[PDB]
Structure formats: structure tokens, C-alpha cells
Design an enzyme around this catalytic site. Sequence first.
Site, PDB file in Angstrom:
ATOM      1  N   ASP A  26       0.785  -1.231   0.000  1.00  0.00           N
ATOM      2  CA  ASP A  26       0.000   0.000   0.000  1.00  0.00           C
ATOM      3  C   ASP A  26       0.818   1.284   0.000  1.00  0.00           C
ATOM      4  O   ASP A  26       0.596   2.184   0.841  1.00  0.00           O
ATOM      5  CB  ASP A  26      -0.984   0.014   1.170  1.00  0.00           C
ATOM      6  CG  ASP A  26      -1.697  -1.317   1.332  1.00  0.00           C
ATOM      7  OD1 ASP A  26      -2.131  -1.903   0.314  1.00  0.00           O
ATOM      8  OD2 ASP A  26      -1.828  -1.753   2.526  1.00  0.00           O
ATOM      9  N   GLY A 104     -11.152  -6.650   7.621  1.00  0.00           N
ATOM     10  CA  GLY A 104     -12.434  -7.172   7.310  1.00  0.00           C
ATOM     11  C   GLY A 104     -13.598  -6.597   8.085  1.00  0.00           C
ATOM     12  O   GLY A 104     -14.740  -7.076   7.979  1.00  0.00           O
ATOM     13  N   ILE A 145     -11.071   3.861   5.689  1.00  0.00           N
ATOM     14  CA  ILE A 145      -9.661   3.520   5.451  1.00  0.00           C
ATOM     15  C   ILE A 145      -9.276   3.954   4.046  1.00  0.00           C
ATOM     16  O   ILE A 145     -10.131   4.392   3.239  1.00  0.00           O
ATOM     17  CB  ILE A 145      -9.386   2.004   5.639  1.00  0.00           C
ATOM     18  CG1 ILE A 145     -10.064   1.148   4.583  1.00  0.00           C
ATOM     19  CG2 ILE A 145      -9.751   1.531   7.046  1.00  0.00           C
ATOM     20  CD1 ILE A 145      -9.725  -0.320   4.725  1.00  0.00           C
ATOM     21  N   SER A 163     -13.246   1.286   1.278  1.00  0.00           N
ATOM     22  CA  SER A 163     -12.926  -0.112   1.013  1.00  0.00           C
ATOM     23  C   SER A 163     -14.162  -0.930   1.342  1.00  0.00           C
ATOM     24  O   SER A 163     -14.611  -0.960   2.495  1.00  0.00           O
ATOM     25  CB  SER A 163     -11.784  -0.535   1.960  1.00  0.00           C
ATOM     26  OG  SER A 163     -11.539  -1.945   1.878  1.00  0.00           O
ATOM     27  N   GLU A 200     -11.376  -0.699  -3.406  1.00  0.00           N
ATOM     28  CA  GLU A 200     -10.710   0.017  -2.335  1.00  0.00           C
ATOM     29  C   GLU A 200      -9.563   0.831  -2.924  1.00  0.00           C
ATOM     30  O   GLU A 200      -9.385   0.879  -4.158  1.00  0.00           O
ATOM     31  CB  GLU A 200     -10.238  -0.932  -1.206  1.00  0.00           C
ATOM     32  CG  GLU A 200      -9.096  -1.867  -1.562  1.00  0.00           C
ATOM     33  CD  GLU A 200      -8.793  -2.901  -0.498  1.00  0.00           C
ATOM     34  OE1 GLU A 200      -9.554  -3.021   0.507  1.00  0.00           O
ATOM     35  OE2 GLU A 200      -7.809  -3.665  -0.694  1.00  0.00           O
TER      36      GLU A 200
END
Length: 314
Positions: A26, A104, A145, A163, A200
Site C-alpha cells: 500500500d 475485514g 480507510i 474499502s 478500495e
Amino acid sequence: VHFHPFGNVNFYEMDWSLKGDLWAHDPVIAKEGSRWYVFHTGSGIQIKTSEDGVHWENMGWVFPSLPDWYKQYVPEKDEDHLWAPDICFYNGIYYLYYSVSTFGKNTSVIGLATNQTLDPRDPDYEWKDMGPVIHSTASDNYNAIDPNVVFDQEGQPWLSFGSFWSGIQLIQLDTETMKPAAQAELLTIASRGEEPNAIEAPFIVCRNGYYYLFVSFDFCCRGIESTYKIAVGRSKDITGPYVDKNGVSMMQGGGTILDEGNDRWIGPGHCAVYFSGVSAILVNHAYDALKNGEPTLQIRPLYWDDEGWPYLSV
Ligand SMILES: [Ca+2]
């Protein structure tokens, strides 16, 4: 790009055969003077530096000890990894947004750290904890996020993020606080229209009067079983509608695929796009099939065809 400056260097001339410490997940990149920096997901936000953009060295982290306020938003977080940092440079200050979450789940908050410089040798180097930016709880239909800041052509900063859940969100920031107003409207700008909604990592840039929304489709974080791909759409207005090459809105699963990997690089995604003059680079990670699926930094020249759409080459 005033808020992502890269001097005069010419990305299309450079040899982007990266070397050194290339584990990354990321990523984003900034350049200050002769030094380049990667920020990426990991303990306390991980940092790498390079003299040239090509040979990378691991260099420390932003938060050696995590702020207490994270617990007010994500009380079950029990480890120190911070995700998906985003860097920009405005009014002399480096604004580093990042994600506090648990995988998650959408109990999440985006935080902001600021610094006067990226050079730890400088007496004014200090990453200050400037607190939360926007958050989600389990009854929200979004996940706070994966931040990205873009300044539109008119100088207004905007935050995109999101996301899964309802997908990619967009909100105006104030120029002095670099946070949304308390009554700012949250807009949803991209969605697969599927459940689960695997979209995302938004990143918006402006080129010749269009805003390009880059996103990642499908699944990160599974090594060689990752199915991540990079997709793009565009709009003349920063609030949408973002549409792909086929004329399909990104709110209906539109998005032109820029990279879906191959038998060597699996699951490329979570990208960033930077410019220097009219040259550009795509930055992302991908999972190395020759090295146990380990996530690896990629930096590649990003070209633009005569209709304005980006593409990679060899
Ligand atoms: Ca990002």
C-alpha cells in the site's frame, strides 16, 4: 503537481529496475530535495528512503508508540500496524493520512500526522499526532480507510477513501485544518455494485481537465492467491460521474483495467500516480510468485494514449 512535487527529473528517461529493500504494501511516495521517501502499511507506518528513486533502504517508522485516541474508535485493535498512508505537501507542511482498523471490519478511523520536513536530520523533524479525520462504525455503510488527498484545479482539497461496504467515498477538506467540516457532505463515487463490494484504495489525479480515479478491484492480502487488479475511470468534474473507456459509470462496476498481473507478479494493486513535467509513474505493490508471494514495491512509467487514457508498457 504542487502537492506532490517531483522537481525536474524525468520519469520516462529513468531506469526503474528497483533494488534494495523492496518489501512494501500500500505505498505512496514523496520527494523533498534530493531524497525520496516511501510510506507504506506496517508497524507505526513504515518508511523507506532513496537517493534516486530506485535503490531503496528501510528507514524507521512514524509512530513508535500509537496514540491513545485510536482506542476510542477501534477499541479491539490489538497490534501496531497502520495502513495505507497517503502523503501530500501544502503550505510547507507534510500531511500524512493513514488508516486505523482491523481487517475485514468497518470499525475504522483515518488519522492525520504532520511534519515540517521529511528529513530526520533536520531539527524541525517531528511527526505530530493531529488526530482523527473521519471514522466509520459498524452501522455506517462505508469504511474509513485508504485515504487519498487531491487538490482540484481550483485549489480545493478533497479526501477520497473507502474499502468494501458502499465503496469509494469523497469529501471536501478545509485548507487550514486539512479536515472535513463537521457538516460536510460525504459522496459515494465508485462501487462494484456486487456483494461483497471489492473496491478500495482510491487515488485521484487531474490531467488535462479530467480527474482520473484509480482504484483496486478484488482481493489483496492472499499472497499468490491474491486477485487484486488496478482499474481507472475519469470525469471532468471531481464529484463524478467517473466513467470508464466503455462509458460505464464506476458506480455500476465500471473501470478500465490497467494491470491484473501475470504468472510472475500476482495481484498488483493499491496504487499511486505521480507526475514530473509531463512524465508520470504508477506506484503499487504486487505479490512475488518467485518469493513466497511477498508484497513488493513496483514503480513503472505510466504513459497516456491520444484519447487521454493511461497505459503501462514493457
Ligand atoms: Ca492509497
